[PDB]
Ligand binder design. Sequence first.
Ligand SMILES: *[C@@H]1O[C@H](CO)[C@@H](O[C@@H]2O[C@H](CO)[C@@H](O)[C@H](O)[C@H]2NC(C)=O)[C@H](O)[C@H]1NC(C)=O
Ligand SMILES: *[C@@H]1O[C@H](CO)[C@@H](O[C@@H]2O[C@H](CO)[C@@H](O)[C@H](O)[C@H]2NC(C)=O)[C@H](O)[C@H]1NC(C)=O
Ligand SMILES: *[C@@H]1O[C@H](CO)[C@@H](O)[C@H](O)[C@H]1NC(C)=O
Ligand SMILES: *[C@@H]1O[C@H](CO)[C@@H](O)[C@H](O)[C@H]1NC(C)=O
Ligand SMILES: *[C@@H]1O[C@H](CO)[C@@H](O)[C@H](O)[C@H]1NC(C)=O
Ligand code: NA
Lengths: 1323, 57
Amino acid sequence: DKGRGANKDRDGSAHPDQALEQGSRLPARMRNIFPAELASTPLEDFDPFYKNKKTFVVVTKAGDIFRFSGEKSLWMLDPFTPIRRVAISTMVQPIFSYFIMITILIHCIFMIMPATQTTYILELVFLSIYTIEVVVKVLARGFILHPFAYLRDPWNWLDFLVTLIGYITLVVDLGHLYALRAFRVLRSWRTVTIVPGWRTIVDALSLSITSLKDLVLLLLFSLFVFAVLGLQIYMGVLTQKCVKHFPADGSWGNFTDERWFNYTSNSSHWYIPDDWIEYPLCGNSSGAGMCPPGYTCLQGYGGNPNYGYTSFDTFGWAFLSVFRLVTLDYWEDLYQLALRSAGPWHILFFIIVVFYGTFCFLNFILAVVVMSYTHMVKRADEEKAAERECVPWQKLQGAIGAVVLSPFFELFIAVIIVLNITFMALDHHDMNIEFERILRTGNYIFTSIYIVEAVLKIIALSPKFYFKDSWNVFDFIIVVFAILELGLEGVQGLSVFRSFRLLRVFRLAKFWPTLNNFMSVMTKSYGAFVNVMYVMFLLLFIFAIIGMQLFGMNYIDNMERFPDGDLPRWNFTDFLHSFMIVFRALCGEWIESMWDCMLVGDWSCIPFFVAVFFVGNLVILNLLIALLLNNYGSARDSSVQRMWSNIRRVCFLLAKNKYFQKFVTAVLVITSVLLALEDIYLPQRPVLVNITLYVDYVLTAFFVIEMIIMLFAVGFKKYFTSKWYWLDFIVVVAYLLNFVLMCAGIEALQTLRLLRVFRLFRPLSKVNGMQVVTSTLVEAVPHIFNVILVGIFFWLVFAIMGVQLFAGKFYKCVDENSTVLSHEITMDRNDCLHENYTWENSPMNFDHVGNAYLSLLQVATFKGWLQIMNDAIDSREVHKQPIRETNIYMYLYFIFFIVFGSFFILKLFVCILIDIFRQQRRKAEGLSATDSRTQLIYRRAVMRTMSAKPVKRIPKPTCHPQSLMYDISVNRKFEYTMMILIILNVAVMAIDHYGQSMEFSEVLDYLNLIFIIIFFVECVIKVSGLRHHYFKDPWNIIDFLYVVLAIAGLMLSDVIEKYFISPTLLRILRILRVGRLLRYFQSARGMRLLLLALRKALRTLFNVSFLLFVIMFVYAVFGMEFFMHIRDAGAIDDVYNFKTFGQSIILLFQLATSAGWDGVYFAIANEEDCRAPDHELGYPGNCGSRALGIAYLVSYLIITCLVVINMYAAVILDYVLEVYEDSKEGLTDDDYDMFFEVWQQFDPEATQYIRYDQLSELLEALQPPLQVQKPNKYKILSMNIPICKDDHIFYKDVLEALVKDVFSRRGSPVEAGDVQAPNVDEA
Amino acid sequence: SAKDGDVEGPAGCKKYDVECDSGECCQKQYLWYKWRPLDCRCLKSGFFSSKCVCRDV
Ligand SMILES: *[C@@H]1O[C@H](CO)[C@@H](O[C@@H]2O[C@H](CO)[C@@H](O)[C@H](O)[C@H]2NC(C)=O)[C@H](O)[C@H]1NC(C)=O
Ligand SMILES: *[C@@H]1O[C@H](CO)[C@@H](O[C@@H]2O[C@H](CO)[C@@H](O)[C@H](O)[C@H]2NC(C)=O)[C@H](O)[C@H]1NC(C)=O
Ligand SMILES: *[C@@H]1O[C@H](CO)[C@@H](O)[C@H](O)[C@H]1NC(C)=O
Ligand SMILES: *[C@@H]1O[C@H](CO)[C@@H](O)[C@H](O)[C@H]1NC(C)=O
Ligand SMILES: *[C@@H]1O[C@H](CO)[C@@H](O)[C@H](O)[C@H]1NC(C)=O
Ligand code: NA
């Protein structure tokens, strides 16, 4: 409307074009001062040659009017065909922009190769070709001086500055920088314009970054609050070590003086166990680190962990640690480095920062990326839709075709393909001689059957109808390659040709239709995935060349800083290593790489790894979820009848009461906390053993008396047909079976006593908002079962591939201390076992496809994969020693699995729960499923009118000082002044650092004395002026709690305080008071729209987390019964284990975000060098179970991390769409709050009526979208606003007639009539 | 006794890392400072290929 309003306007009046180009259009017009034969819209082809094809360009302007025309410059130079005409014809050639594009692709190749003598001589050539190209386009346009010049287009600001940087580097200019040379790769961003359909992904990427402006300011605010909060309670805490006591003898003299400090600062006196790199932390709290005997936990000696980079000691390092906790990478280290030194009750710091950081604010990022991509696909689809609108030979063929066409020969090939997939999965390492023969002689039978069915197919159908369909031409490639595996059975080079047996797995895609439907979506919209995947690897290419030119020579020069003095496996030293340290940070794992870029370099790694994590993970991996969302989203019987029916009369009345149902729920909750109290201490608690024994007798009679009552109430037909009563009946059987065995000598099975925690789920679903949460998980379980089966299929292809690449190759020679001998000592198993060493295998391997399934789970979650990829790169042959970094191109196997198995299969879980939740939340609000998204906007704006009530002004008191106490307690000057003081009170807490001084500590101690005096007057004014309405706002309580506990700290020194009035609780009430800011920004429309969608989601986000804790409760009581007696390995130790319930909850919370499941698996599945249990002596055995550890962890990871964490993303996504649909078209909830905020200043008493002369005053005081400015009177004259018989009008009549105004001015087509029809139905 | 290469079993049989056809592999072998019992196994070598040689249990 506006941009095409200046289409012919400035091209008619300001300056016309000098040419045009759309489909081989090579004219050169002018600005009508000396023009030459442009057009008169006659679409003629008479005079010239380029004017002849201009009719074909205008015939292309009849179906494709505005897509390709090249708008030339203004004239602005008086160039009436000089040599500038040569440049305007050179510039528009299709071979000119094919030529510069090829030199970019060649100059990218000479960046992955190492630099040599000829590398410098091509930089002379490429800078020459890129500078003719900047001279042509400026000798064919302007510079910036007129419109439509060279520097007016954003692609020309790229290829100009990058040419100017190449001038300063190549020819000697300024000599000294050399860091700008890394930025020469940015010219290869314009190679995105080579793949068809590029503008939809590049515009959705630019629309995302523009729309993430008001989220970053809200994330940077909340990261500021959590990093002051973590600064105040964790300062100096990560330095706590175990220090040995000062002796009563010895090399240090006996006098206890500052020789204590000499002895204590000595590093040889800090406890470290043997062959460990870092010192173990410890604390004095209850379930903390627990220093060995002869030691004491002390602060202030040595450094913080992770080369000193993990700390809360300054505001800088606290901001980085709070940011890696919002991100979620390696957070289980910081979580375990903080609860070991501070104690287990500090899980509450980590629950809040994970709930508000990564479960809320990182799903607002996903919701913005999805809306930006959906807005571009919606534009592109409607723009394309406008563009679219012999006698025996014939005898046997009727007989051969009689069996082939029928669906019985099609069944027999389906059985053999399933049987062929089974024989490829049974191949493994170390097979015996007869079982390996079955797999060879079955290969000969499968091959000849595929040959017979491919020669009975061309005879039956036709030789020209066989090549018709695409499944017969894929079946024909299989029988060609199977001949090559048998013709080249033993000649040479047959490793390549037997790899193409894996393509027979994809022949299952024709028969069963769940996988067939999944393949059709990949072939329908494929180029949308090609654009996202090419933009993904091109950004990775740019961060990889930038990385090795900036951080590359630090790894070689300062190599001595690394702990052994050698390079890590992950560095920036060449191209493939730089591509993998950057691909790793795409996947969400950036901080261990940032730790040693910064150990060896400087501060410049901190903007690098944040920017490659931001663009790569939070935008590009979410733009791939928005792509799967738009493509995969779719006697005398009547004498006993009177007695048996009075039994069912009593029981049915009793089963429906409120008090009977609350009594049953109270028994189930209390007895389930009894179940969390059997732990490793329950033997030696003899009174608790008897209570546990008697509750099992009450419940085995309570479960029977209740079952009989529920069986008279609901009957046999409706009891045994419901899934809640098959849950109850299994617990009744499992407690009668325990009562039977206990009488008959046998001790009762402990795994059947724990079954009564499942009876906890039925009253959990009765909580206020739990019905949308649990109905989605029941509707989604047939959908996510089909994503398991399809994902088990695609991981079978990479399991049988990875067994054939790596089986038997993860063996290595191993010394006494489990360290790996290098080669030149032992090169094979002969040399290893000749010198009594051990030839061990890795615990995570590809030996059979059962082990391979478990290694691919571990690289898909990115938890354990660093060790698996090291074994594969080192592996060379079967009985040979692995050499470091030798099979380095096996990284490409893992890139294509992570792309197709983790970025694609696991995101279909997020896709399902988003689609199920929208339609269940619609079902819970009574809305109809067949209402297409516009009629629900108008229905939502009318239901808020019927529920609207004007609020009453707080009564102003009339006392002697209390008039002014109301005057100043209400003005915006005083309520903004006291908000600036809260911001300054807390920004002064940010300059607190560890070990500051006694005088820096006293300046700030005096400033806190001034603010508490100021905050005491501001408390006494707002309590005087607002006498009991002061306590109605929840931020006035936290103001009032803080001032009371701060005055009572400054006095009352002779208290018996033992953390009684502790300063840690005062520091939290200083900072929690900042959140008054969240209700003061409303002029920021983009934030107020995003805090509104959060506030409406808080109820059902609390219900996802309370479902989460019950799933953690059930598995903690099961994990204590399984893994309480387990030897320490990997992650299980004296602090983090399954011994008690609270210690189990520390583990299952960490493990809910999948963090560290590989090292938890290593302990609870350990079946080697342990001790068998000894029942009749009193010993339980320290053995794990492999089968029970897999069925416990794979169970928790898919139940809690793949579906219930993904429920947070579904709920956020649903409300951000509804709130932004309100701000654009309908009316937000905060717009009805501002009507009654203006309404109460025209009736303070809420007399619910205003004077008629007050209404033209009213509409001037409203702010848009409801306002009507001057002259509003004649629009009031059209709203018609029915008046009562006092010239006073009702509030709803004003509010109803203003909703109809917003919908009429904004939408023409169906907006007024559908809004007025819904208001008649609701009244 | 216990020479660094020794076999038990019938006269003429396959020693360690020598290709076996499903029998004909020696009863016992003295390698690495013990008597190990030998067996015929098929170990992985290439895509869907395995050479079958005498290897200890
Ligand atoms: C843990 O508790 C011990 C003992 O209460 C504390 O040790 C004292 O530390 C001070 C230095 O701050 C020494 O001068 C004392 O001699 C130590 N006392 C004893 C009995 O050894 C230790 O500071 C506490 N650690 C904390 C709070 O992190
Ligand atoms: C360790 O290897 C050595 C040779 O590398 C083996 O050699 C024996 O060593 C013992 C002493 O420990 C001598 O008494 C024997 O004479 C050596 N030879 C033989 C054939 O046994 C030794 O067997 C290996 N260690 C063990 C425990 O077996
Ligand atoms: C630590 O203690 C040892 C004890 O002999 C002493 O020799 C050494 O100088 C001390 N200091 C350091 C930094 O090792
Ligand atoms: C005290 O210990 C430090 C290191 O812990 C050492 O450098 C210093 O020499 C010691 N002081 C003496 C031995 O007087
Ligand atoms: C194992 O113990 C120490 C620590 O690594 C080392 O000095 C020793 O050489 C190792 N190897 C042995 C005892 O074979
Ligand atoms: Na990391």
